Design a protein around this ligand. Structure first.
Ligand SMILES: O=C(O)c1ccc(C(=O)O)c(C(=O)O)c1
Length: 437
């Protein structure tokens, strides 16, 4: 396949639903390359578990953990890593309040070249066990011969864009990885990088990050079609931030406006938001504990009940994953009959202003609180006008593997969004338990 978009392995589904899936042990296997050094960008780490996922012969190679933890949380992570002399740490600066380092990425340096993995899972056992998670695997990038002068750049500008993302950290350990990337040929890359970094961006820099980055790419590299107003927008996520008192504050005013963009020319577009209901979580493989990774709080939700009329259940019969709660985040633009898509994005970014950015200073400044990273699949990057939706995710090449069912199904009148910090004691989960936070 040209897309190299994978799901993680799920324990408990039939083998046909894991045949083309990837576990972290598969990614780090010697079959993918002879490891020299790696960087693990993430939010949550179980270091003992993480080292065990590397092949035994590679467990003493240098590992850099890129994280956002501060104060006692930072101390706890350093304590986890101190037993392993080969592990270094890089604290990403979070100078804007309420920001987090959400980016999930592996940089894998081999004797044979370099690989980049952009994915959605925390580095803990539970995130790779029974969740729906997404992975994009780069090609093996060869080294540019010493003395040869070439860009190693792709038509999607991925090399420059990845270096720009890393430069924003202003960190010495990542300057080393920038120099590694400079030395490799990334020209085969067919995806666009969409990142968020913390800051306040005006002028030219506004288009570098967050939903303005997405808008710029859709303006420049997608085409509008007739009846574009009938092509819905779908967003699918594992948490929701505070979006404001009504849809005009952010969701349908600047966020949807960026997501609607197609082509260079100057709204009733349907918006489908996919987020697990309480019943989805209760009947899941993990049961109610799956809701520990769906951190929508009652404090946030009670100020925006307007939002929940947009919500659709999690359903993923196409990939056998209806009971594997989603920690993947995806956004896409299907046709009115959901048979084609104009683009597809897999990312760490949830439905929040912190992740995507919010306009400030009379619309002239985009403020982002967090680090996020995803990759955008555009038909033009594959010589196509649109992608045909693959009917069965794992079945039998230019059709895009959408991991959940279309059309999405609206919540029923008795359904409620999963809210993690209130109790559920009416009906027990698949393990026999209630939920009492
Ligand atoms: O909203 C939060 O507090 C939150 C924190 C961390 C993560 C993560 O796994 O990186 C997520 C998520 O991606 O669902 C959400």
């Amino acid at each position: 396949n040209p897309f190299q978009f994978y799901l993680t392995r799920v324990s408990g589904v039939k083998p046909k639903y894991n045949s083309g899936a990837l576990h972290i042990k598969d990614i780090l296997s010697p079959l993918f390359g002879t490891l020299v050094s790696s960087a693990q960008f993430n939010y949550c780490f179980d270091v003992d578990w993480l080292v065990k996922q590397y092949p035994p012969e590679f467990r003493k190679k240098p590992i850099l953990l890129v994280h956002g933890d501060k104060r006692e949380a930072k101390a706890h992570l350093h304590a986890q890593a101190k037993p392993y002399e080969n592990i270094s740490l890089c604290q990403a600066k979070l100078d804007i309040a309420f920001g987090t380092h959400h980016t999930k990425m592996m940089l894998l340096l081999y004797e044979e070249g370099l690989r980049v993995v952009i994915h959605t899972s925390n580095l803990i056992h539970a995130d790779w066990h029974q969740k729906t998670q997404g992975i994009w695997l780069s090609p093996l990038y060869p080294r540019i011969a010493d003395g040869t002068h070439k860009s190693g750049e792709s038509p999607t500008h991925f090399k420059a864009d990845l270096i720009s993302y890393l430069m924003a950290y202003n960190a010495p350990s990542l300057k080393e990885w920038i120099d590694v990337i400079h030395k490799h040929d990334l020209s085969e890359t067919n995806v666009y990088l969409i990142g968020s970094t913390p800051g306040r961006f005006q002028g030219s820099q506004k288009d570098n990050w967050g939903h303005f980055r997405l808008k710029k790419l859709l303006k420049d590299h997608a085409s509008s079609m007739p009846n574009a107003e009938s092509w819905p927008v779908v967003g699918q996520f594992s948490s929701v931030g505070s979006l404001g008192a009504d849809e005009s504050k952010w969701l349908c005013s600047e966020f949807k406006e960026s997501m609607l963009t197609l082509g260079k020319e100057s709204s009733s577009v349907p918006l489908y938001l996919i987020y697990p209901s309480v019943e989805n979580v209760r009947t899941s493989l993990e049961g109610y504990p799956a809701g520990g990774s769906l951190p929508y709080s009652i404090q946030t939700a009670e100020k925006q009940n307007w939002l929940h009329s947009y919500f659709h259940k999690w359903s993923a019969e196409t990939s056998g994953r209806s009971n594997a709660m989603p920690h993947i985040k995806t956004y896409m633009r299907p046709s009115p009959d959901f048979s084609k898509i104009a683009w597809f994005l897999v990312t760490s970014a949830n439905l929040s202003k912190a992740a995507w950015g919010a306009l400030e200073k009379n619309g002239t400044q985009l403020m982002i609180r967090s680090y996020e990273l995803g990759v955008l699949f555009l038909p033009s990057a594959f010589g196509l006008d649109s992608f045909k939706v693959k009917q069965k995710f794992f079945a039998g090449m230019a059709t895009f593997p959408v991991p959940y069912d279309l059309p999405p199904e609206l919540y029923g009148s008795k359904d409620r969004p999963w809210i993690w910090n209130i109790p559920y004691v009416k009906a027990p989960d698949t393990h026999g338990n209630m939920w009492v936070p």
